[PDB]
Write a protein that binds this DNA or RNA. Structure first.
Length: 78
DNA sequence: TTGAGCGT
């Protein structure tokens, strides 16, 4: 139901790469990685929106290895 | 090049 955030994301990692990973847990609507609009390099974190609530907690209920680094899905601070 | 945090 809510937009999740992911911390610890490697720098080279991209949006497509996440879809590959989170699409293993369930219905992914969108993903957006945060970058500098001058370089396009990733801040090391992004967001992710699922369709089902089951798949969201499952993801928020654990840590995730991504690009060779562990990342934690948390509830944000809109 | 970098590694806690929180979305043009």
């Amino acid at each position: 139901t809510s937009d999740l955030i992911v911390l610890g994301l490697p720098w080279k990692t991209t949006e497509q790469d996440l879809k590959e990973y989170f699409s293993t847990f369930g219905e992914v609507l969108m993903v957006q990685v945060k970058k500098d609009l001058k370089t396009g390099h990733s801040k090391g974190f992004g967001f992710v929106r699922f369709t089902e609530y089951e798949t969201q907690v499952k993801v928020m209920s654990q840590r995730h290895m991504i690009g060779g680094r562990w990342c934690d899905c948390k509830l944000p601070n809109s």
